[PDB]
């Protein structure tokens, strides 16, 4: 097919805390590293999305420890992971306001193990 769309005369410039990422998935997990994959915002209209803060936590103390801040890419490889357990992860949104009030937590947890299934 073929179609387009263009035409508007308004500048909705309403600054405010950045929302969470469209979604957050886990590319995969191998050895003692985890691969996270979050999608970009649908807004992206206020403050150049500086980056995205990642936080990992275990199902033991559910403690969140700043993994990375003011990032760039949309994917980051986690480290320091113990094989034979699970862990969570949440991606935040920064720019100027601060950290997104809410974070898109992986629908599921990543099971650490010395293996990798190429499901894609």
mmCIF file of C-alpha atoms in Angstrom:
data_model
loop_
_atom_site.group_PDB
_atom_site.id
_atom_site.type_symbol
_atom_site.label_atom_id
_atom_site.label_comp_id
_atom_site.label_asym_id
_atom_site.label_seq_id
_atom_site.Cartn_x
_atom_site.Cartn_y
_atom_site.Cartn_z
ATOM 1 C CA UNK A 1 0.000 0.000 0.000
ATOM 2 C CA UNK A 2 0.899 3.671 0.204
ATOM 3 C CA UNK A 3 -0.105 6.458 2.560
ATOM 4 C CA UNK A 4 1.215 9.351 4.610
ATOM 5 C CA UNK A 5 0.300 11.899 7.255
ATOM 6 C CA UNK A 6 1.428 15.450 7.921
ATOM 7 C CA UNK A 7 -0.282 18.616 9.096
ATOM 8 C CA UNK A 8 -0.576 20.346 12.450
ATOM 9 C CA UNK A 9 -0.262 23.751 14.070
ATOM 10 C CA UNK A 10 0.331 23.246 17.775
ATOM 11 C CA UNK A 11 3.260 22.738 20.118
ATOM 12 C CA UNK A 12 2.171 20.660 23.089
ATOM 13 C CA UNK A 13 5.150 21.504 25.265
ATOM 14 C CA UNK A 14 4.239 20.180 28.692
ATOM 15 C CA UNK A 15 7.324 19.297 30.701
ATOM 16 C CA UNK A 16 6.908 16.603 33.328
ATOM 17 C CA UNK A 17 8.446 13.433 34.705
ATOM 18 C CA UNK A 18 9.213 10.953 31.915
ATOM 19 C CA UNK A 19 7.079 7.831 31.737
ATOM 20 C CA UNK A 20 8.298 4.221 31.647
ATOM 21 C CA UNK A 21 9.522 2.366 28.553
ATOM 22 C CA UNK A 22 7.022 0.901 26.118
ATOM 23 C CA UNK A 23 8.197 -2.523 27.219
ATOM 24 C CA UNK A 24 11.138 -4.336 28.768
ATOM 25 C CA UNK A 25 12.371 -7.758 27.724
ATOM 26 C CA UNK A 26 15.481 -9.854 28.233
ATOM 27 C CA UNK A 27 17.520 -10.506 25.110
ATOM 28 C CA UNK A 28 18.948 -13.562 26.830
ATOM 29 C CA UNK A 29 21.128 -14.784 29.671
ATOM 30 C CA UNK A 30 24.440 -16.609 29.488
ATOM 31 C CA UNK A 31 27.200 -17.412 31.951
ATOM 32 C CA UNK A 32 27.097 -14.677 34.565
ATOM 33 C CA UNK A 33 25.618 -11.981 32.355
ATOM 34 C CA UNK A 34 22.088 -10.996 31.410
ATOM 35 C CA UNK A 35 20.868 -9.277 28.267
ATOM 36 C CA UNK A 36 18.095 -6.736 28.691
ATOM 37 C CA UNK A 37 16.011 -5.208 25.925
ATOM 38 C CA UNK A 38 13.695 -2.258 26.432
ATOM 39 C CA UNK A 39 11.816 -0.272 23.816
ATOM 40 C CA UNK A 40 11.909 3.497 23.266
ATOM 41 C CA UNK A 41 9.238 5.920 24.496
ATOM 42 C CA UNK A 42 6.231 6.837 22.389
ATOM 43 C CA UNK A 43 6.406 10.405 23.639
ATOM 44 C CA UNK A 44 9.957 11.550 23.001
ATOM 45 C CA UNK A 45 8.761 15.140 22.949
ATOM 46 C CA UNK A 46 10.041 17.292 25.788
ATOM 47 C CA UNK A 47 13.566 16.434 26.868
ATOM 48 C CA UNK A 48 15.979 14.451 24.728
ATOM 49 C CA UNK A 49 15.817 11.069 26.418
ATOM 50 C CA UNK A 50 19.212 11.278 28.078
ATOM 51 C CA UNK A 51 19.233 7.532 28.610
ATOM 52 C CA UNK A 52 17.754 4.818 30.796
ATOM 53 C CA UNK A 53 18.696 3.691 34.285
ATOM 54 C CA UNK A 54 18.780 -0.056 34.814
ATOM 55 C CA UNK A 55 18.322 -1.798 38.142
ATOM 56 C CA UNK A 56 18.787 -5.459 38.985
ATOM 57 C CA UNK A 57 17.510 -7.315 42.026
ATOM 58 C CA UNK A 58 17.316 -10.865 43.324
ATOM 59 C CA UNK A 59 14.323 -12.786 44.619
ATOM 60 C CA UNK A 60 16.043 -12.995 47.984
ATOM 61 C CA UNK A 61 16.026 -9.406 49.188
ATOM 62 C CA UNK A 62 14.385 -7.861 46.148
ATOM 63 C CA UNK A 63 16.986 -5.136 46.521
ATOM 64 C CA UNK A 64 17.446 -2.779 43.596
ATOM 65 C CA UNK A 65 20.997 -1.629 42.965
ATOM 66 C CA UNK A 66 21.721 1.035 40.374
ATOM 67 C CA UNK A 67 23.291 -0.905 37.528
ATOM 68 C CA UNK A 68 23.782 1.988 35.136
ATOM 69 C CA UNK A 69 22.665 5.598 34.925
ATOM 70 C CA UNK A 70 22.441 8.173 32.160
ATOM 71 C CA UNK A 71 22.900 5.413 29.612
ATOM 72 C CA UNK A 72 22.677 5.643 25.840
ATOM 73 C CA UNK A 73 21.851 2.371 24.125
ATOM 74 C CA UNK A 74 18.600 0.555 24.802
ATOM 75 C CA UNK A 75 20.368 -2.653 25.756
ATOM 76 C CA UNK A 76 22.894 -3.420 28.467
ATOM 77 C CA UNK A 77 24.608 -6.626 29.524
ATOM 78 C CA UNK A 78 24.343 -7.272 33.244
ATOM 79 C CA UNK A 79 27.121 -8.941 35.198
ATOM 80 C CA UNK A 80 27.912 -10.443 38.582
ATOM 81 C CA UNK A 81 25.194 -13.070 38.403
ATOM 82 C CA UNK A 82 25.083 -16.326 40.331
ATOM 83 C CA UNK A 83 24.107 -19.405 38.357
ATOM 84 C CA UNK A 84 21.144 -21.301 39.757
ATOM 85 C CA UNK A 85 18.735 -18.503 40.589
ATOM 86 C CA UNK A 86 16.493 -15.816 39.150
ATOM 87 C CA UNK A 87 16.566 -12.033 39.088
ATOM 88 C CA UNK A 88 14.475 -9.045 38.075
ATOM 89 C CA UNK A 89 15.173 -5.862 36.147
ATOM 90 C CA UNK A 90 13.558 -2.503 35.493
ATOM 91 C CA UNK A 91 14.335 0.240 33.002
ATOM 92 C CA UNK A 92 13.835 3.861 33.981
ATOM 93 C CA UNK A 93 13.534 7.048 31.962
ATOM 94 C CA UNK A 94 15.765 10.067 32.450
ATOM 95 C CA UNK A 95 16.397 13.365 30.703
ATOM 96 C CA UNK A 96 16.210 16.211 33.191
ATOM 97 C CA UNK A 97 13.352 15.632 35.604
ATOM 98 C CA UNK A 98 14.839 12.465 37.048
ATOM 99 C CA UNK A 99 14.005 8.776 37.181
ATOM 100 C CA UNK A 100 10.649 7.574 35.907
ATOM 101 C CA UNK A 101 8.241 7.097 38.789
ATOM 102 C CA UNK A 102 7.298 3.731 37.334
ATOM 103 C CA UNK A 103 9.533 1.195 35.631
ATOM 104 C CA UNK A 104 8.576 -1.505 33.157
ATOM 105 C CA UNK A 105 9.627 -4.698 34.898
ATOM 106 C CA UNK A 106 10.317 -7.733 32.744
ATOM 107 C CA UNK A 107 7.053 -9.628 32.451
ATOM 108 C CA UNK A 108 9.220 -12.448 33.746
ATOM 109 C CA UNK A 109 12.533 -13.025 35.483
ATOM 110 C CA UNK A 110 15.805 -14.152 33.949
ATOM 111 C CA UNK A 111 17.022 -17.565 35.039
ATOM 112 C CA UNK A 112 20.794 -17.603 35.349
ATOM 113 C CA UNK A 113 22.490 -20.649 33.874
ATOM 114 C CA UNK A 114 25.546 -21.600 31.853
ATOM 115 C CA UNK A 115 23.488 -22.078 28.711
ATOM 116 C CA UNK A 116 21.790 -20.194 25.902
ATOM 117 C CA UNK A 117 18.940 -21.137 23.598
ATOM 118 C CA UNK A 118 18.876 -19.339 20.267
ATOM 119 C CA UNK A 119 15.130 -18.821 20.119
ATOM 120 C CA UNK A 120 15.688 -16.116 17.530
#
